[PDB]
């Protein structure tokens, strides 16, 4: 039986290490008038803006490329015992499954 300690070491998130400028692939799951909720797959979903190039080619279920900046935007302020989580992620659009 494979326990948790062995299956965690072979996780792609462990192989990626820090989330600073990592190239990842994410599949869109919801569409807004101009915003795109792309789930790169780690914990949260990043909100990106529809570019002017091939903006119509972005539909529900499309896989796109991202450069992950931060995994979960959390920070502290004055008089806050905990942090203020944004419940999102930070990522930018580069391409849409160039293959």
């Amino acid at each position: 039986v494979e326990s948790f300690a062995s299956m965690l070491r072979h996780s792609p998130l462990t192989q990626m290490g820090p989330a600073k400028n990592k190239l990842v692939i994410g599949q869109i799951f919801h569409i807004v008038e101009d915003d795109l909720y792309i789930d790169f797959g780690g914990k949260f979903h990043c909100v990106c803006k529809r570019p002017e190039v091939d903006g119509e080619k972005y539909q529900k279920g499309t896989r796109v490329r991202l450069r992950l900046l931060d995994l979960e935007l959390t920070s502290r302020f004055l008089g806050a015992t905990t942090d203020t989580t944004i419940l999102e992620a930070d990522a930018v659009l580069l391409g849409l499954q160039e293959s």
């Binding site: 302020f77 004055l78 008089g79 806050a80 015992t81 905990t82 203020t84 944004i86």
Partner: protein, 116 residues
């Protein structure tokens, strides 16, 4: 950036003299202050200057120069249209600034946690 805060207030663990004497507890409130009657500037000043230049030069008659009379009215009409259309466009969108009526609702969604 944000100024340093360690070693400023009067606490039991601080061995030196307190530097900052806060009037009220430095806790980030969940609602911003309302903007004190945000104002705007006038319009068509350059179009009015070149319009009154005709009056001062041709001894105050409109039959001499006319384009400086028509461009002034065009600027007035465009300003009158922008005063009404932008007064709704900027309140519907949030690209630039925003009134505190929305900042308060944005902060209440993710407020500060003084306790626990």
């Amino acid at each position: 950036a944000t100024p340093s805060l360690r070693g400023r207030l009067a606490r039991l663990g601080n061995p030196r003299r307190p530097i900052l004497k806060p009037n009220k507890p430095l806790i980030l409130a969940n609602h911003v202050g309302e903007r004190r009657r945000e104002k705007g500037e006038a319009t068509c000043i350059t179009e009015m200057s070149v319009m009154m230049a005709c009056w001062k030069q041709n001894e105050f008659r409109d039959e001499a120069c006319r384009k400086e009379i028509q461009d002034f009215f065009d600027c007035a009409s465009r300003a009158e249209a922008a005063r009404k259309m932008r007064s709704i466009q900027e309140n519907l969108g949030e690209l630039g600034s925003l009134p505190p009526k929305k900042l308060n609702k944005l902060l209440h969604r993710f407020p500060n946690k003084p306790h626990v």
